[PDB]
Amino acid sequence: SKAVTRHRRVMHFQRQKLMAVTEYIPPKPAIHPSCLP
Amino acid sequence: GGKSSGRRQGIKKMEGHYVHAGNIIATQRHFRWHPGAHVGVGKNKCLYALEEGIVRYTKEVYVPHPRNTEAVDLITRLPKGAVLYKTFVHVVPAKPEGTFKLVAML
Amino acid sequence: LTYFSARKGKRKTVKAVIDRFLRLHCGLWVRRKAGYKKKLWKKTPARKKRLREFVFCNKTQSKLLDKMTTSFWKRRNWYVDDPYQKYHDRTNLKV
Amino acid sequence: KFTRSRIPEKVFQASPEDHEKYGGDPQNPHKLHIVTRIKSTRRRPYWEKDIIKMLGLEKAHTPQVHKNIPSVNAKLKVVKHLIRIKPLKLPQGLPAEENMSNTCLKSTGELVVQWHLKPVEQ
Amino acid sequence: PYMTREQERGHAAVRRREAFEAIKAAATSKFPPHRFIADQLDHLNVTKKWS
Amino acid sequence: QEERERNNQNPWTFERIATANMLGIRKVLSPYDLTHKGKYWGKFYMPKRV
Amino acid sequence: YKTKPTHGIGKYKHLIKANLGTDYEYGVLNIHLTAYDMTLAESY
Amino acid sequence: RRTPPLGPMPNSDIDLSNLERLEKYRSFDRYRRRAEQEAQAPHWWRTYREYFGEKTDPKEKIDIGLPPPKVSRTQQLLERKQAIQELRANVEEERAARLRTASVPLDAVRAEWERTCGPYHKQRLAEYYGLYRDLFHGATFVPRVPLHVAYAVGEDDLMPVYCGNEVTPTEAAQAPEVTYEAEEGSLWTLLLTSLDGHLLEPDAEYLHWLLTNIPGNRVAEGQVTCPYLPPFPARGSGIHRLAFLLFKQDQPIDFSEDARPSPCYQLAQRTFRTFDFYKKHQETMTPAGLSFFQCRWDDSVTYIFHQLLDMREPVFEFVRPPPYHPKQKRFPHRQPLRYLDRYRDSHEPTYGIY
Amino acid sequence: SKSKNILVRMVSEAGTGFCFNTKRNRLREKLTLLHYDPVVKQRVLFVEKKKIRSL
RNA sequence: CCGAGCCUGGUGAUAGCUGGUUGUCCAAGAUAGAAUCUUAGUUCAACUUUAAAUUUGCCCACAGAACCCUCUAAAUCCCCUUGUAAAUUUAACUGUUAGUCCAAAGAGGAACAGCUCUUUGGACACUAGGAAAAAACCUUGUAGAGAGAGUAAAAAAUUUAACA
RNA sequence: ACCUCGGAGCAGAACCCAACCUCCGAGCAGUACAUGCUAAGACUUCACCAGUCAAAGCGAACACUCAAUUGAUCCAAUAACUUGACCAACGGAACAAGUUACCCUAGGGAUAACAGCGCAAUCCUAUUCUAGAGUCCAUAUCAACAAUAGGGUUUACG
Numbered sequence A: 001s002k003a004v005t006r007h008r009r010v011m012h013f014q015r016q017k018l019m020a021v022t023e024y025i026p027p028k029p030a031i032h033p034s035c036l037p
Numbered sequence B: 001g002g003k004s005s006g007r008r009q010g011i012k013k014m015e016g017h018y019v020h021a022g023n024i025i026a027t028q029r030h031f032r033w034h035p036g037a038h039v040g041v042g043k044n045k046c047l048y049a050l051e052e053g054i055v056r057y058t059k060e061v062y063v064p065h066p067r068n069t070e071a072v073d074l075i076t077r078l079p080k081g082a083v084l085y086k087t088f089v090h091v092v093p094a095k096p097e098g099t100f101k102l103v104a105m106l
Numbered sequence C: 001l002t003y004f005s006a007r008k009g010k011r012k013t014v015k016a017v018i019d020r021f022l023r024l025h026c027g028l029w030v031r032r033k034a035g036y037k038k039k040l041w042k043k044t045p046a047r048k049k050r051l052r053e054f055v056f057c058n059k060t061q062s063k064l065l066d067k068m069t070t071s072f073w074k075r076r077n078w079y080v081d082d083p084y085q086k087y088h089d090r091t092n093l094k095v
Numbered sequence D: 001k002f003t004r005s006r007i008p009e010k011v012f013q014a015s016p017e018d019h020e021k022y023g024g025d026p027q028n029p030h031k032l033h034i035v036t037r038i039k040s041t042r043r044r045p046y047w048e049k050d051i052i053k054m055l056g057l058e059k060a061h062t063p064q065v066h067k068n069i070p071s072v073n074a075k076l077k078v079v080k081h082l083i084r085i086k087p088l089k090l091p092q093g094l095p096a097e098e099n100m101s102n103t104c105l106k107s108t109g110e111l112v113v114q115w116h117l118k119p120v121e122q
Numbered sequence E: 001p002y003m004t005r006e007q008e009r010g011h012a013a014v015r016r017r018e019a020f021e022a023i024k025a026a027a028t029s030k031f032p033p034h035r036f037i038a039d040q041l042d043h044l045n046v047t048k049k050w051s
Numbered sequence F: 001q002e003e004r005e006r007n008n009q010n011p012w013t014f015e016r017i018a019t020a021n022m023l024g025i026r027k028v029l030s031p032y033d034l035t036h037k038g039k040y041w042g043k044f045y046m047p048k049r050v
Numbered sequence G: 001y002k003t004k005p006t007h008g009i010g011k012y013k014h015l016i017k018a019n020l021g022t023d024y025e026y027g028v029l030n031i032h033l034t035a036y037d038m039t040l041a042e043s044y
Numbered sequence H: 001r002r003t004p005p006l007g008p009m010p011n012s013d014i015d016l017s018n019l020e021r022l023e024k025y026r027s028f029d030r031y032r033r034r035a036e037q038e039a040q041a042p043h044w045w046r047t048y049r050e051y052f053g054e055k056t057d058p059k060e061k062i063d064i065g066l067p068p069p070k071v072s073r074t075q076q077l078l079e080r081k082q083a084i085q086e087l088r089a090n091v092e093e094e095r096a097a098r099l100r101t102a103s104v105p106l107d108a109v110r111a112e113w114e115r116t117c118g119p120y121h122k123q124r125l126a127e128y129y130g131l132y133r134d135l136f137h138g139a140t141f142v143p144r145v146p147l148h149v150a151y152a153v154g155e156d157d158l159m160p161v162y163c164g165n166e167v168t169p170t171e172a173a174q175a176p177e178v179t180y181e182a183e184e185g186s187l188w189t190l191l192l193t194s195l196d197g198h199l200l201e202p203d204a205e206y207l208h209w210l211l212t213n214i215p216g217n218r219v220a221e222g223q224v225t226c227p228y229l230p231p232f233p234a235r236g237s238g239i240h241r242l243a244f245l246l247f248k249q250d251q252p253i254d255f256s257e258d259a260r261p262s263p264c265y266q267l268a269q270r271t272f273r274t275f276d277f278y279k280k281h282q283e284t285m286t287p288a289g290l291s292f293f294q295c296r297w298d299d300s301v302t303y304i305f306h307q308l309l310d311m312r313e314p315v316f317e318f319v320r321p322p323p324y325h326p327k328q329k330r331f332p333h334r335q336p337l338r339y340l341d342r343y344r345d346s347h348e349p350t351y352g353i354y
Numbered sequence I: 001s002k003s004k005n006i007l008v009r010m011v012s013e014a015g016t017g018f019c020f021n022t023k024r025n026r027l028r029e030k031l032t033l034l035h036y037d038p039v040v041k042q043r044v045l046f047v048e049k050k051k052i053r054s055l
Numbered sequence J: 001c002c003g004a005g006c007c008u009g010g011u012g013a014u015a016g017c018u019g020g021u022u023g024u025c026c027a028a029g030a031u032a033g034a035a036u037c038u039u040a041g042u043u044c045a046a047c048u049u050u051a052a053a054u055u056u057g058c059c060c061a062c063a064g065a066a067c068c069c070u071c072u073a074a075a076u077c078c079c080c081u082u083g084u085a086a087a088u089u090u091a092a093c094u095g096u097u098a099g100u101c102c103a104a105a106g107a108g109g110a111a112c113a114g115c116u117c118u119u120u121g122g123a124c125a126c127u128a129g130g131a132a133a134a135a136a137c138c139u140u141g142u143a144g145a146g147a148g149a150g151u152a153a154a155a156a157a158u159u160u161a162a163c164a
Numbered sequence K: 001a002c003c004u005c006g007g008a009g010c011a012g013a014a015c016c017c018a019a020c021c022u023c024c025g026a027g028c029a030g031u032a033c034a035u036g037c038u039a040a041g042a043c044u045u046c047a048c049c050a051g052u053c054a055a056a057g058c059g060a061a062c063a064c065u066c067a068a069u070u071g072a073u074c075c076a077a078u079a080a081c082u083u084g085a086c087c088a089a090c091g092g093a094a095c096a097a098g099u100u101a102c103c104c105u106a107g108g109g110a111u112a113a114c115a116g117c118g119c120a121a122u123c124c125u126a127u128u129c130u131a132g133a134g135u136c137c138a139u140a141u142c143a144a145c146a147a148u149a150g151g152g153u154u155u156a157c158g
């Protein structure tokens, strides 16, 4: 198929693994700010 | 139409290549590369080496011949201080013209 | 090509090759240029210069013409005052 | 079109935080490499296959020693995703003529010149 | 890198030049093996028998 | 989005891997992926990709 | 060559040229010079 | 992929905003003059001068000549301006200049040229022949004192030697007339060497004349260290150049180590190097004049080798490299029949075993 | 495809027998050129004799 | 079995078409094209094989390859070192070229098709493991025996609406 | 309609690179009359055949323009030099059209129709949007420009 398609074209498995590994991970504080005074 | 194949025209001798007299250096439809030192140009703008040596490509100031009216009218409309440049291919001679050898003792 | 004749049982020679080609004993085949007498008024002197020249056939063409001729045409001849006598043997040839 | 890759020079620029992480010293770089192929040349371009042969990395998991020089490093940067690179360390120094038969390359990258096969008395 | 491009240049020219000369020697030494007269005569042993 | 890139705890990013040709990943990528940096796939734009 | 640092050294057309009058300048003026003497009109 | 330039662009200074209000060349000559100036400037890209221009060392060539004369520019300029006004005052000069009938006297111009800028032009002209490159290994000197050398041909004609003029050995069979302006009580040293006259060592030179401790202009009274020997360029060896070197002595100098027997017909003793000779005498001796000429082979050269030198005259010839032919192939495709003649040695028929 | 020009044969006036073919316009007088004759190794007058074809 | 009877002979007619093409073992070994009353074929080249000769071959540091033209592209060509061991020429001929799918760039169709047509690369027609079964995805190749060992790829996530 | 040859885009930077492709053409004319004779070394439309450039030398003066502007062998004509085909099916057979459902043979799922399968332009259905009809009133009903998904019943495409 074409490079750009109207529907979401399925990624190659190697590319899909790359996307899953390189996902944003928000920083996690040691203690939740709400619980601290 | 438009089924014509490519003419296989381009650089035949790259930078630093050793060439002999008569070797074709570059084939071009238009003057992409201009003949330099010891480089001849044929009817079809074919650049051939006039001497045996090493091929060099440099950027040189382009001063067109006064008889060539079209190119003269181009430099006369340039702003003062502007200078045109073009790529020139040169052949640096490697061997000397000859040597003096002893042949007899009279 | 007739590999075995019907009356002698021997290989024949294609006369088209003999008339159109000349074989030197060194193995080279000398031919003419196709079109050296056709429409000479529309051809440049440089083009006509290489049309009236005698050229050598390459390896594939030479091997083809060696099978279409018998051994009588590969023998060494000693014609008196032969224009191509000096070209029947190679000199200073390596590999 | 898929073609070769031009790796930017900034990629091979170790940061100060990397010298405290991998134990290397930029002032005194190691002399020899320990290259080991850990990936198949199959399903990879032909130019990567040729470089593997030039480096003597035919058989997988077979350590090879190469010199840390730019020309050799140039070939490594092409197949850097198919090999494992470790420095060669010499705790006892370069093997001599009398220590050729007693060498052994451990998994840590160190080449010992006295392979005694004997438990340490300490 | 242990050495720069300038330092590395020419440090293995002799070894590389000698390595190819060994390839040339092996390539130019290809010739049919010697034929001994003992081997030809040893085929007559097929008819060796007891008296 | 600029904040997300700075505080991202993932040590691996699309830009780093694609540019350096890590794992030979450029065999399944596109020349545009060196500039899109994984945020664009076809005509679709992914705002959550860092 | 384009990748070379000397790319574009031969470019020349950007140095060659390919009316409305604003509130600060006069757009078009025709200076008519009428005289019965042809030499005086040509000379001026 | 684009790489930023290593330096300023040739036409970067031109502003493209007000292109219509910029003065153009409007002529071919105006562009050519500007084109030449930039062609002589260094550039960060590859240029013709890089591969074909003669490479020169960053070190400036040292000067071993006399100090320049002291001239008051203000007084010198004042007289010149007045002389021009007097010349322009005459209406006859203007009429001759307007009618294009006036002319200048060549002899008077050269006499003034020889004293004002003659030494500087000769120094530049000497560099073209590579005299400083060979005699002094690049060291230059201004010929402050002009040297007048002329050979007596017959009894009334003279052949002057200014700078590289053609002189035949027949005209140079005897010692020439040497004259120069000098003060009384000064000591001078004449020298004549052939740079390319050597037959064995390319670097070494042959000594033809050496006069030392010359009192003023009296050349004859000077010591005859080396007898005069006519130039002997071998036939077919090209054009040789012989340079006259005139030195000014600060104190009397003893040339016992450089003394040569009279006559000196051995080329081993005639061997002479200007660099080493001046190296051991640079303290008390300084070059003052310079003159040189080019010499060809003629019939008189045969006299020198046979009678004087007592040897066979060597004959040279200009030999060119053999023509290049590609490696011969068994089957030359699309090649003319004359291809075989290119690789054939003998033009006479061969028969082999027959 | 009207034949604007024709191909004619020029015969040397020197009697050497040398001849060459040239192209000329149909609506024109017979040419009289001054061409080089290799037989005498100098330029000799040539005159059109017979038309060969139409171009 | 009559749009031209049957039989014999020419006749082993011819068929670029269909089918078949018999013992063992080992080795090398796949996808540029041009011409063709030619695209169901053939010839040449490319590729492949053996033998032989010879010396460079491949990888590639700078330098170098256009202007009218900023899709200012990915990247090539050239190319000493260097890593390596092939390459060229000579001799003798066969055979393959109705290809597929995946990734990528770009065309035609409808920003459809297991669609068509080029380019780069991979795999497949060569083994094995894993994706459920699986020619084209991933892992992995040079070959045997073992009732030893270490590993490669390799198991989908997700449950959503009160309100002054 | 098309068949040969050339330029531009695809094919962005050495070369090369296809259609049913996207566009424009060429089957000449003009000036020469040394547009003469010879000869190193090279290019080459992916083979061959053809095609292109060319220093020096001899001889004269003091390798014509043009992207294409072209046709091989045999043969005929000719004293000779040279010339001859919209052979345009343009690598060209010296000269041969229809029809067959009366048809025959050898094959082909490389290849059609029916079918199966792929695909969802068309078709079909439900939501989203709230403009607009429904006396007033979006939402009793109905519905525009569109959007978001599903279905594989038609017409097409492969």
Ligand code: FES
Residues within 6 Å of the ligand: A034, A035, A036
């Ligand atoms: S759990 Fe800490 S505020 Fe409630």
Ligand SMILES: [K+]
Residues within 6 Å of the ligand: J016, J040, J041
């Ligand atoms: K067929």
Ligand SMILES: [K+]
Residues within 6 Å of the ligand: J037, K089
């Ligand atoms: K045909």
Ligand SMILES: [Mg+2]
Residues within 6 Å of the ligand: A001, A002, A003
């Ligand atoms: Mg695609």
Ligand SMILES: [Mg+2]
Residues within 6 Å of the ligand: B002, B003, B004, B005
């Ligand atoms: Mg085209």
Ligand SMILES: [Mg+2]
Residues within 6 Å of the ligand: none
């Ligand atoms: Mg019957």
Ligand SMILES: [Mg+2]
Residues within 6 Å of the ligand: none
């Ligand atoms: Mg049969």
Ligand SMILES: [Mg+2]
Residues within 6 Å of the ligand: none
């Ligand atoms: Mg095998």
Ligand SMILES: [Mg+2]
Residues within 6 Å of the ligand: J037
């Ligand atoms: Mg035909």
Ligand SMILES: [Mg+2]
Residues within 6 Å of the ligand: K044
């Ligand atoms: Mg070719």
Ligand SMILES: [Mg+2]
Residues within 6 Å of the ligand: none
């Ligand atoms: Mg055809």
Ligand SMILES: [Mg+2]
Residues within 6 Å of the ligand: none
């Ligand atoms: Mg053709």
Ligand SMILES: [Mg+2]
Residues within 6 Å of the ligand: none
């Ligand atoms: Mg009917």
